[PDB]
Amino acid sequence: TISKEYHIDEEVGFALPNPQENLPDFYNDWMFIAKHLPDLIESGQLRERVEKLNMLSIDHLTDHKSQRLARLVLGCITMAYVWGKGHGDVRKVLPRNIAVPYCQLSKKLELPPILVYADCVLANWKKKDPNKPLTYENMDVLFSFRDGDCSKGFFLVSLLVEIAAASAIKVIPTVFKAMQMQERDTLLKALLEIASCLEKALQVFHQIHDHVNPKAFFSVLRIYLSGWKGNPQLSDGLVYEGFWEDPKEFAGGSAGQSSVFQCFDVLLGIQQTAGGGHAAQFLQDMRRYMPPAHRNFLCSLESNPSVREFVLSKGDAGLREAYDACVKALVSLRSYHLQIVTKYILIPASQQGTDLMNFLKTVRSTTEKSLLKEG
């Protein structure tokens, strides 16, 4: 069994199990703004409502779930405040009334004061009926940015892939125990169960077409998830008034911050983070935007003996085929994902991307080159 200190759930994996939907009454002013971003932004009332807030203390957020919900509320408000209507009129100073509690809560959770994948995907969900299974029809997001932005489809389909991966994550300890105990048959069975689970996760990706449309995703959702790191619109970063004197740069919400495929890259010895390349530097940097428990899970997998080295040292075709079935399942997920990116980003950008495609192609290439046979 995976240690409880890694915050990995048997059912939902890296996702936050049963996230909190409501904050204590003390934070009603935060919740009102966050729940009505589409309306407040469109009417030009968002920035005024934010500037009218009183500085609320974070001491009444007494557990992980309420703190995670609060991080999500303040992060969505910060994106709406900075980007406004998403047309270029930006704010370069985040008011102290929100910047101070946001940075305090971020320091406590060891995350940067910007919306990350763990907020907008991992904690941004609920079951409609708690007695029904984790299916799209029985689920919803907690917050969106604009009407018709497809954030429910995008965040929920990412979450459903994250949940499909949970059945593979839970087999990780069986793999390491079989290697330590020198139990070849147990290792082969575990590698095939991981491959089977990752193969099932591919079908989950097909749901993206039913719930997201390219125009809205490209022109709207992409704008609100942007950060202020290497961004010409906020060339020096954002001023977090009352917390830091100088403006600070933070990258926008990204699945590069996700642990879902990354723990399988680490498990299988696919060295995505090796070297000084752009792709490797970006994946390493994005670990800082990942929850500490999850960052710790990855580095502890890196400390464990190599599964690839063990499989290569045995002269066993069945073991190599089971290992390659896991690598191939990752290649298939990344190849399908590249087709999604062509439809949702490449084509809309052409009707007005290269670096995004190159990063994804490098990660997919590194995965494919790890196959022991399929060449």
Ligand X SMILES: O[C@H](c1cccc2cncn12)C1CCCCC1
Residues near ligand HEM (CB under 6 A): 154, 157-158, 161-162, 205, 208, 212, 217, 254-256, 258, 260-261, 334, 337, 340-341, 344-345, 356, 359-360, 363
The reply on whether position 222 binds ligand X by CB under 6 A is yes
Task: Rule CB under 6 A: choose which of 121, 141, 195, 279 binds ligand X.
Answer: 121
Contact between 373 and 318 under an 8 Å Cβ cutoff? The reply is no
Nearest distance in Å: CB 215, ligand HEM: 12
Q: Does 225 bind ligand X (CB under 6 A)?
A: yes
81 binds, among ligand X, ligand HEM, none (CB under 5 to 8 A by kind): none
Residues within window 152-171 making contact with ligand X, judged by CB under 6 A = 158
Interacting partner of 359 out of ligand X, ligand HEM, none (Cβ under 5 to 8 A depending on kind)? ligand HEM
Q: Which amino acid is at 302?
A: E
Q: Cβ of residue 155: shortest distance to ligand X, in angstroms? A: 7
Q: Which does 117 bind (CB under 5 to 8 A by kind): ligand HEM, ligand X, none?
A: ligand X
Minimum CB separation from ligand HEM for residue 153, in Å? 8
Pick one of ligand HEM, ligand X, none as the site partner of residue 294 (Cβ within 5 to 8 A by kind).
none
Retrieve residue 40's tokens.
């407040």
CA gap 367, 329 in Å, rounded? 10
- Judged by CB, which is closer to ligand X: 225, or 307? 225
Least distance CB 217 / ligand X (angstroms): 7
Nearer Cβ to ligand X (158/167): 158
Residues 252-281 interacting with ligand X (rule: CB under 6 A):
253-256
Tokens of 35: 């729940």
Decide which of ligand HEM, ligand X, none touches 225; Cβ closer than 5 to 8 Å per partner kind.
ligand X
- Kindly tell me which of 100 and 141 has the beta carbon lying closer to ligand HEM: 141
Q: What is the smallest separation between the CB atom of 52 and ligand HEM, expressed in angstroms? A: 33
Which residues in the 320-339 window bind ligand X by CB under 6 A?
none
Name the token pair of 293. 């428990």
Minimum Å gap between C-beta 207 and ligand HEM is: 8
Residue 117 in contact with ligand X, rule: CB under 6 A: yes
Alpha-carbon distances of 274 from 219, 279, 306, 316, rounded to whole Å: 34, 9, 15, 27
Is 337 marked as a binding-site residue? yes
**Residue 157 touches which member of ligand HEM, ligand X, none, C-beta under 5-8 Å by kind:** ligand HEM
Footprint of ligand X (CB under 6 A): 117, 120-121, 158, 222, 225, 253-256
Annotated binding site: 337
